[PDB]
Structure 1
């Protein structure tokens, strides 16, 4: 277990050092996306919340394939604007309901430090 708090201001600095194994020790869900929304990293805590098997979703498109309920101005729209503007830091509540029991979460999206990557952080509410 990696001690990093959800919403920490310098979270992107902290997570740049972690490899996939250590991401799996976080207390919250973490997804790393490229600028097109393809999944690069998906941790164990996220799979505990959504039921997905982390290794099976890496490489899939989050908005088109895995999470169609986020294909909306309120989620996807915010991501696409942040990728265009090159800056992103927003937190909101959302409900995940595709092929799963409707689950309410807090979502934190933030630009990664390295190049064209973006974090999606999730915890239950």
Structure 2
């Protein structure tokens, strides 16, 4: 297991070092998005929570294609304000319910140390 706690203040520095294999060792779901919401990385723990196959959703658009339930002011709205602003750090509870058993989660979105990319971290509550 890769040893990083959900919600850690320096999580974006820790995860900067990790390739897709290391990301699969985390204790929580992790998705890396570009500024348009396209999926760049998607780890094994996220697939365990949601049922999606990580390999298959890379390159899809999270808001339009994969996760329409997050296309709302309460999730996508927060994301797009963060991308526009160039800063994002927000944690909230949400329910994921698209083509799956409704599953309550805690979501943390944070701008990556990269460039123009953004993390979404997910764990069960």
TM-score by length of 1: 1.00
Q: State the SS of the aligned residue for 1:73.
A: coil
Deviation at 1:88, TM superposition (A): 0.1
Deviation at 1:106, TM superposition (A): 0.1
CA distance in 2, matches of 1:74, 1:93: 10
Structure 1 alignment gaps of length 5 or more: none
Deviation at 1:57, TM superposition (A): 0.1
Please give the per-residue CA displacement for 1:50-91, whole angstroms capped at 9, x wherever unaligned: 000000000000000000000000000000000000000000
Deviation at 1:29, TM superposition (A): 0.1
Structure 2 alignment gaps of length 5 or more: none
Q: Work out the number of aligned pairs and report it.
A: 125
TM-score by length of 2: 1.00
Deviation at 1:8, TM superposition (A): 0.1
CA distance in 1, matches of 2:81, 2:109: 12
